[PDB]
Amino acid sequence: EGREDPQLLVRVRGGQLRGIRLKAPGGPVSAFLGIPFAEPPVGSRRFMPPEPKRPWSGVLDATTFQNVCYQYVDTLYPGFEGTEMWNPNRELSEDCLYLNVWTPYPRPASPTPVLIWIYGGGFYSGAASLDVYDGRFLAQVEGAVLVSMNYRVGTFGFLALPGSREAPGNVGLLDQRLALQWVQENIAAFGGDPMSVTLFGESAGAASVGMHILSLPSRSLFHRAVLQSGTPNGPWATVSAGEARRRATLLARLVGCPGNDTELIACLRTRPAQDLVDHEWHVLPQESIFRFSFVPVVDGDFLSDTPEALINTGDFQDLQVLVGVVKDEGSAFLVYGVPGFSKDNESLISRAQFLAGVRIGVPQASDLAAEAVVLHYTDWLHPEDPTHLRDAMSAVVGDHNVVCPVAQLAGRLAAQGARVYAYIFEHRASTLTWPLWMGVPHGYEIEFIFGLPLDPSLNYTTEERIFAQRLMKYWTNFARTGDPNDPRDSKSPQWPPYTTAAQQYVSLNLKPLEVRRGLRAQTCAFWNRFLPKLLSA
Ligand SMILES: Nc1ccc2c(c1)c(-c1ccccc1)[n+](CCCCCCc1cnnn1CCNc1c3c(nc4ccccc14)CCCC3)c1cc(N)ccc21
């Protein structure tokens, strides 16, 4: 042990770890990468809840990111930064249950607020080791302890035969919960305050954060939550038990597996990981965007009822949440199989291409409901205009899947006692490689929250760097105090809480905070109040 940095040896419940001193623009940070938190969910453990990592002897090397959970690697535009940056940057393995910790260097003398990141990727992809989730900046600049975990995705994480012992569903959420217990027991060793833990996440990550809010055992493992561009309620983040059974069964069938649940699961198990991935998209009931095959299941266990029912009837008195959306939630989804759309042209579509796109975006919808969406999203002054049709298509997808589900999460937590803060993120990164027409696409605020623009080698404007500092300040102020506003700062414009009466939220851009009212109030009344009833009859 004798000749290495004394500031990088830490013990956890499972044994000794050696971390790595990393360089950040302002100075050094401690990182402890690839800490096993669960027994490898391999072999007979596939589809099964995670078991706590057994203790090891000797010093575990925690200097590098560990394997990414098995997943479909995106190949829409091979070589393209815009898609590759989300693709796994470590080898794929079922042995993937590891978490990462960044802390100031030297580690803080007094108990520090902890941020826990949960990545998105439609519950079928993603990794805590992606460049855009690098905790070094928040660690260094804000003095925060940042934890991020891998969790199982796709079949391995969410395939369920509800009611069975061998494949209960929701195990990917259980991986996340186990990483949270790991933080409770171990984060004090790194100088984190386990009594001050904020979850934050984007997309499926946000939806996950939301499910932890709505699940009893998880509630005791954190104090605050941030949901970025995603919600537990909504059309994509969950499935009924019935539907999850249908999908598991169909996939079983597609890989050559037959009648009860034990035999079926044993057979799946058995199957090479790649075979499962290769067939997962085939189980979707309709041609669709923003829908994913294997997602959290309403099991009557982890989720005791539908997220809708739980937000309508829950008590959220002691909760504080920060929630928000980006300007162009839907645009990215269009290039993934809406005919008409491409990254390499303006995507000026036709009316036919729009009606076709609406069916794909609202899958789900009877002929009448589709007519409603179309009528509501058509500009009747220019009903044939390709620019507007392209933007309406984007908005349809963005509104239905993200903006409007966020609109109620907020309105609904607020009506039941939560302190809520809402934002629209409106800045397009100067470094962004998607075309202009896509505006500010799903996921493109994360790099700012994590303070990447502070890395001078990244070529961000000045400007964008000051902006990244502001957001980091809002987020860690929220983590620290349940309120993004600067306590001492007299002059800087206030971020008011979202309420049902005033419906206030802020724009996050290069200009100072501007308070707007109503989150697409008029349009979200369509998706949240009218469409459901139209779908009944
Ligand atoms: N021929 C085949 C064979 C197998 C599969 C195929 C196609 C497709 C497909 C590809 C193109 C068009 C239509 C379908 N998808 C569906 C992909 C749909 C992905 C939608 C975009 C998205 C949403 N959340 N995560 N992602 C994946 C990419 N990661 C991103 C992320 C984020 N933001 C963005 C923004 C732009 C581009 C990507 C992206 C932010 C959060 C995390 C990931 C699959 C999905 C599967 N689970 C398995 C197989 C296949």
Atom of ligand 1 nearest to the CA of 75: 10
215 is known as an active-site residue: no
**Hey, which bits of 229-318 come out as E strands?**
239-240, 297-298
Ligand 1 pocket, 76 CB below 6 A? yes
* CA 336 to ligand 1 centroid distance, Å: 7
Angle, alpha carbons 111-117-118 (nearest 5°): 145
Positive or negative, the CA dihedral 403, 409, 411, 414 is negative
231's tokens: 């919600």
Q: Is 243 helix (H, G, I), strand (E, B) or coil?
A: helix
Q: Which two tokens stand for residue 158?
A: 């969410």
Structure determination technique employed = X-ray
**Strand, helix or coil for residue 187:** helix
Report all structural domains of the chain as residue ranges with CATH numbers, in order of start. 1-537 (3.40.50.1820)
Query: CA-to-CA distance for 94 and 266, rounded, in angstroms?
Result: 17
Q: Of 21, 106, 36, which is closest to residue 66 (Cα–Cα)?
A: 36
**Of 125, 129, 148, 203, which residue is the catalytic one?**
203
Report how far Cα 161 is from the mean position of its chain's Cα atoms.
24
- Distance (Å, whole) CA 232 – CA 235: 9
Residue spans of alpha helices (H) in 295-362:
307-313, 331-334, 351-361
Q: Is the CB of 377 under 6 A from ligand 1?
A: no
Residues 6 or more apart in contact with residue 146 via CB below 8 angstroms: 101, 102, 103, 114, 115, 116, 117, 135, 138, 139
Ligand 1 proximity of 151 Cβ (cutoff 6 Å): no
Beta-bridge partners for 326: 425
For residue 437, what are its two tokens?
């027409």
The sheet carrying 15-18 orders its strands as 9-12, 15-18, 59-61
Task: Tell me how many degrees the CA angle 81-140-210 measures, rounded to the nearest 5.
Answer: 65
CA 442 – CA 501 distance, rounded (Å):
29
Question: Apex CA 331: angle with CA 327 and CA 332, to 5°?
Answer: 115
Resolution (A): 2.8
Give the whole-angstrom CA distance, residue 460 versus residue 462: 7
> Is 240 noted as a catalytic residue in this protein?
no
Distance CA 503, CA 515 (A): 10
Residue bearing the CA closest to ligand 1, atom 37: 83
Which residue has tokens 């928000």?
324
DSSP string, 120-162: -STTT---TTSGGG-THHHHHHH--EEEEE----HHHHH---T
Residues with Cβ < 8 Å from 252, sequence gap 6 or more?
A: 258, 264, 267, 268
From ligand 1's centre to the CA of 120, what distance in Å? 11
Q: Which two tokens stand for residue 361?
A: 């975006």
* Rounded-to-integer distance, Cα 207 and Cα 210, Å: 5
Burial class (CB in 10 A: 0-12, 13-18, 19+), 457: exposed
CB 366 within 8 Å of CB 402: no
Q: Can you tell me the distance from the alpha carbon of 398 to that of 406, in angstroms, rounded to the nearest whole number? A: 11
Q: b/e per residue, 45-58, with b = 16+ CB within 10 A?
A: bbbbbbeebeeeee
Based on the residue annotation, tell me whether 329 is a catalytic residue of this protein: yes
Judge residue 110's burial from the number of C-beta atoms within 10 Å of its C-beta, 0-12 exposed, 13-18 middle, 19 or more buried. Answer: exposed
441: left (phi over 0), alpha (psi -120 to 50) or beta: beta
Give yes or no for a contact between 279 and 251, defined as CB atoms under 8 angstroms apart: yes
